[PDB]
Design a protein around this ligand. Structure first.
Ligand SMILES: [Mg+2]
Ligand SMILES: [Mg+2]
Ligand SMILES: [Mg+2]
Ligand SMILES: [Zn+2]
Ligand SMILES: [Zn+2]
Lengths: 79, 182, 136, 49, 48
RNA sequence: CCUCCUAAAAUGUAACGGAGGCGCCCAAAGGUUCCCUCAACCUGGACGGCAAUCAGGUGUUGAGUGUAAGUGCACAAGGGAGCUUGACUGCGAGACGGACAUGUCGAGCAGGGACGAAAGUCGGGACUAGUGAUCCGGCACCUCUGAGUGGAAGGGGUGU
RNA sequence: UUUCUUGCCGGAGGUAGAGCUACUGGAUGGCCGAUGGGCCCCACAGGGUUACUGACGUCAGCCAAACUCCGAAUGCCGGU
């Protein structure tokens, strides 16, 4: 009359943080993820634990390249 | 200025013989010999590894090149085999070395087979490749008769540019192999 | 008495009884069939009983198909037990049946006994059902 | 313990600069490794203490 | 051909019991191998 | 503490709901440069057989990734070889996540190095578990203090 | 007025639904027939046989919270 189940880990709050069109500073975390479900594009780096972060100011833009989902930063212009 | 006898016997007339026999579209079509591969599948080295030393020494003395040790790519207890132990030695013969080696085979070792009744023509691949195994290593004059601790045979594979069985068999017959007829 | 050889998960959520059937809505192997007009879990004992009834009324000839396989398990807790302390143990096998689903299939020479056997089977099922035929 | 904590000291100034772990059964000997030693200001050989 | 890891190779000469001689290469350091039965001396190659 | 489902296509979400794993390991299974592509099947081969080693062909991912599950990886993060210790010191714009205390990523600068022709990469491991606040005490080092003064005892700082 | 509501624009999903020779499993009826059982020859080599068990493949009809070649409506983030 007991279950061998009942234990679980904490939620890691992964997911996309800055969606397409948002303006980000350099170094902002754009998406937290386990694998490379999204691959880095232009001006976007890849962390040790596979989070993509902006390398330069601009506007986030998603896209594809040879069947790969990518995240890019578009260089917004001067005011 | 140096040219092995089998290479010469190929180049002078096997070209024209095969060309007139098969009416090829052009010269590059004509089948030729690429490489010959000699290996000892020891296998029984799993119990004791020192068999590999005799195997590699015999291959070295019969081919003029030292072999490389082939390790196990899978683990199998039914044979009592684990990942990566010395299981076989291979020798790859190309060029004039292959040419004079298989001349030596076709002229010296094979006649020294005990009760040589021939080599089966049906031993081909279906893609122009000939392979035949051997049960003993004493045929080559380059092994002393008192050097044998135990018998250790070989597999000899001949790789040719022949498209399939017909031209493969034709080239090997023209080369002088002792085939049967049935 | 139909039971799957194995299942990946022995304990499962209940099958949902929503909507109407989208596959297996037409008679395909035999001449006449039984079509469901309700939603209901149908156990393997009910299928066994209906199959036996059709066979008995049909006697020698004819062939019977069962397009419904009970692969969904249901669990029940031991009796006289309070709530909690884990999930029950699997002791029914059912197949989810939506209206429009064709359950059984018959191929027999004569229409009268074909329909009579099909009705005999229908009276053993927990659903409202009707007999359908290949022609539109 | 099998994998204990070892401390590596610079061979020149004998300062305990780094602490790490190694398998003692696999590596019964002291660990020779070149590491940056701050006060020496350059990469000097280090030995397990 | 690597430097010195291979067994040495010497041009050799083979003469048979039929009196026919060759020119070839082998590991035989003596530079010549004497054989009893050769290609033209075997019954199979002679057709017997 | 970690992984999946429940969880209702952002995040989060309960129950004595459904399944598993962890309290390690590796001195290379880390860094770098360069090269390679599996599993499976067909055919032919001395022992050798379904399956050891060899050869040819078909084979785009079904093999494998130290270890659970998921997300990834064939452009390889999978296989191999050479050199090597960045499994660094002083830092760190900007962020994620959050009751708080914890936790996580990070471009870039300097020193002093590894590899590489160079560009460049390197602050452990494809990623997420492999752990324990504070107090109290031990050891090493420091251009701190030293109960009248010179020392010393004790106390501080840094690493552990 | 930065909050909120409506219109438009930019986004990333994987639920509902559906689909499966698109994966992992489950699973119905045929066709073909490996393998094995036993029978049949009897040698034990050398060959034809069988209520069968029936692989692999193939034709049709299906199922799944921990299946996905697909995939909404809403909701969420940002701009206007
Ligand atoms: Mg060929
Ligand atoms: Mg009824
Ligand atoms: Mg447990
Ligand atoms: Zn020092
Ligand atoms: Zn002779």
């Amino acid at each position: 009359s007991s279950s061998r189940n009942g234990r679980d880990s904490a939620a890691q709050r992964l997911g996309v943080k800055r969606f397409g069109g948002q303006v980000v500073k350099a170094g902002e975390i754009l998406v937290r993820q386990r694998g490379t479900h999204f691959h880095p594009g232009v001006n976007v780096g890849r962390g040790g634990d596979d989070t993509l972060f902006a390398l330069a100011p601009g506007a986030v833009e998603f896209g594809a390249k040879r069947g790969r989902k990518t995240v890019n930063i578009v260089p917004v212009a001067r005011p | 200025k140096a040219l092995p006898r089998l290479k010469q016997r190929y180049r002078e007339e096997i070209r024209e013989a095969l060309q007139q026999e098969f009416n090829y579209a052009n010269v590059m079509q004509i089948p030729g010999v690429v490489k010959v591969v000699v290996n000892m599948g020891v296998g029984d080295a799993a119990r004791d590894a020192k068999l590999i030393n005799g195997a590699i020494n015999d291959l070295a003395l019969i081919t003029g090149q030292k072999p490389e040790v082939r390790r196990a790519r899978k683990s199998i207890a039914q044979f009592k085999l684990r990942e990566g132990m010395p299981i076989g030695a291979r020798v790859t013969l190309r060029g004039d070395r292959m040419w004079e080696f298989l001349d030596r085979l076709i002229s010296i070792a094979l006649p020294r087979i005990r009760d040589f009744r021939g080599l089966s023509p049906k031993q081909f691949d279906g893609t122009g490749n000939y392979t035949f195994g051997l049960n003993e290593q004493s045929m080559f004059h380059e092994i002393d008769v008192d050097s044998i601790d135990r018998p250790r045979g070989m597999d000899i594979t001949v790789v040719t540019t022949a498209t399939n069985d017909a031209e493969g068999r034709a080239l090997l017959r023209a080369l002088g192999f002792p085939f049967k007829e049935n | 008495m139909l039971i799957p050889r194995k299942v990946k998960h022995r304990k499962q959520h209940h099958p949902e009884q929503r909507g109407i059937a989208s596959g297996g809505t037409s008679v395909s192997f035999g001449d006449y069939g039984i079509q469901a007009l309700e939603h209901a879990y149908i156990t393997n004992r009910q299928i066994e009983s209906a199959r036996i009834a059709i066979n008995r009324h049909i006697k020698r000839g004819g062939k019977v198909w069962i397009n419904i396989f009970p692969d969904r398990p249901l669990t029940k807790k031991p009796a006289e037990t309070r709530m909690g302390s884990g999930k029950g143990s699997p002791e029914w096998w059912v197949a989810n049946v939506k209206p429009g689903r064709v359950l059984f299939e018959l191929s027999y020479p004569d229409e009268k006994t074909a329909r009579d056997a099909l009705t005999r089977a229908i009276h053993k099922l927990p659903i409202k059902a009707r007999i359908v035929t290949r022609e539109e | 313990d099998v994998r204990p904590k070892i401390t590596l000291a610079c061979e020149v100034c004998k300062h305990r600069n780094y602490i790490t772990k190694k398998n003692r059964r696999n590596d019964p000997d002291r660990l020779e490794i070149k590491k940056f030693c701050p006060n020496c200001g350059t990469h000097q050989p280090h030995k397990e203490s | 051909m690597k430097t010195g890891i291979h067994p040495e190779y010497v041009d050799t000469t083979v003469q048979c019991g039929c009196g026919h001689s060759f020119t070839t290469r082998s590991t035989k350091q003596s530079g010549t191998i004497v054989v009893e039965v050769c290609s033209q001396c075997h019954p199979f190659y002679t057709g017997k």
